[PDB]
């Protein structure tokens, strides 16, 4: 039915939500506009990432998505690389690229397993400091350890065992690498998100151009990637609506605690916002997979007008 269980478990949240809802009129309006413009599906930009052979690139994607979370804060974390300034996700991508290019062996499980605060401070050196520096070091050490101990240093061994199932791979990654266990509890019930583990599958698909380690037969089963940028875009487009208390917290850039009802409601409504939009597009002759609709929304999130409600700020390891 729903092997992944993200849709099923999040629908419970959306039905009961107190601080967030979906405006289905906004969904329709946005579906109409996107179908008319015939929006091209975005493609994965391999030029912005490090490139290598299958073994090192597979490990690279694991490392990338292992620390792919939580970039916000003042003073804004920025890096300078080849005469250009980067922030957010693009600073993560550029940072890893810079380090790999300069001979930091970030694809070697041996190095990852023993990486420290000092090494990570250097890799992400720039204006300010990347949030959650110590937690990123701990997660990379976990990632290297498991890679070395369980997969002979090769993420390719994990990907192979998935048998070209996205769902199978998410299960393998979340079991083997505890840092990827992105689940919450809402009104006594487990809620599955798996943001980092899911975006890892789409990154493999992108980086390997649908071949070899990037070949998957069930990409349709991926949901949206419940982060802080996608809900921001959905709110901007009128699809997500917030109760006044939560709206004001976002406006004031007030931290919304991880695991809180409000945080889980935003993430669940993100999942179902994207799913309702996908359905509405299919209706109008423009069939896309949920992950493509995410990529599409995430894109708009780079081009938002000033005066847009700020994205929600949660300190967490999962996004």
Curated annotation (Swiss-Prot):
Active-site residues per Swiss-Prot or TrEMBL entry: 227 (nucleophile or transition state stabilizer)
Protein's recorded name: Queuosine 5'-phosphate N-glycosylase/hydrolase
Main enzyme class: hydrolase
InterPro entries linked to this entry: Q_salvage
Keyword Hydrolase tagged: yes
Record PANTHER family: QUEUOSINE 5'-PHOSPHATE N-GLYCOSYLASE_HYDROLASE, QUEUOSINE 5'-PHOSPHATE N-GLYCOSYLASE_HYDROLASE-RELATED
Organism (species): Sphaerobacter thermophilus (strain ATCC 49802 / DSM 20745 / KCCM 41009 / NCIMB 13125 / S 6022)
Keyword Iron: no
Family affiliation: Belongs to the QNG1 protein family.
Catalytic activity line of the entry: queuosine 5'-phosphate + H2O = queuine + D-ribose 5-phosphate
A GO MF term: hydrolase activity
Signal peptide (residue range): none
Quaternary structure, from the entry: Monomer.
Function: Catalyzes the hydrolysis of queuosine 5'-phosphate, releasing the nucleobase queuine (q). Is likely required for salvage of queuine from exogenous queuosine (Q) that is imported and then converted to queuosine 5'-phosphate intracellularly. In vitro, can also catalyze the release of the q base directly from Q as substrate; however, Q may not be the biologically relevant substrate. Shows a very low activity on queuosine 3',5'-diphosphate, and cannot release q from queuosine 3'-phosphate and from the 5'-nucleotides AMP, UMP, CMP or GMP, indicating specificity for the queuine base.
Residue numbers binding queuosine 5'-phosphate: 68, 89, 195, 225, 227, 294, 298, 302
Keywords from the UniProt entry: Hydrolase
One GO term (biological process): tRNA-guanine transglycosylation
Gene assigned in the entry: qng1
The EC number(s) this enzyme carries: 3.2.2.-
């Amino acid at each position: 039915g729903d092997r992944l269980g993200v849709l099923t478990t999040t629908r419970r949240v959306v039905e009961q939500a107190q601080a967030v809802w979906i405006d289905h009129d906004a969904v329709a309006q946005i579906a109409e506009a996107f179908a008319a413009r015939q929006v091209t599906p975005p493609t994965w930009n391999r030029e912005l990432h490090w490139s290598d052979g299958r073994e090192a690139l597979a490990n690279y994607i694991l490392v990338l998505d292992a620390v792919n979370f939580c970039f916000w804060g003042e003073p804004r974390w920025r890096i300078e690389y080849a005469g250009a300034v980067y922030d957010g996700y693009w600073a993560l991508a550029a940072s890893l690229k810079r380090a790999l290019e300069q001979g930091v062996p970030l694809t070697d499980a041996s190095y990852l397993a023993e990486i420290t605060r000092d090494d990570v401070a250097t890799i992400f050196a720039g204006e300010g400091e990347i949030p959650l520096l110590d937690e990123r070091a701990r997660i990379l050490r976990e990632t290297g350890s498991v890679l070395a101990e369980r997969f002979a240093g090769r993420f390719s061994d994990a990907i192979a065992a998935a048998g070209r199932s996205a769902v199978a791979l998410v299960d393998i990654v979340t079991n083997a690498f505890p840092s990827f266990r992105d689940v919450a509890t809402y009104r006594g019930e487990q809620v599955r998100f798996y943001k980092r583990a899911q975006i890892l599958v789409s990154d493999l698909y992108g980086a390997f151009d649908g071949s070899d380690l990037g070949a998957f037969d069930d990409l349709g089963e991926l949901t949206a990637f419940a982060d802080y940028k996608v809900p921001q875009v959905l709110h901007h487009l009128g699809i997500l609506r917030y109760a006044p208390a939560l709206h004001d917290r976002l406006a004031r850039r007030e931290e919304i605690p991880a695991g809180s009802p409000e945080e889980v409601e935003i993430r669940a409504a993100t999942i179902w916002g994207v799913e309702e939009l996908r359905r509405a597009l299919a209706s109008r002759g423009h069939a896309l997979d949920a992950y493509q609709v995410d990529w599409l929304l995430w894109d708009e999130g780079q081009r938002l007008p000033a005066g847009t409600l700020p994205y929600h700020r949660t300190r967490t390891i999962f996004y």
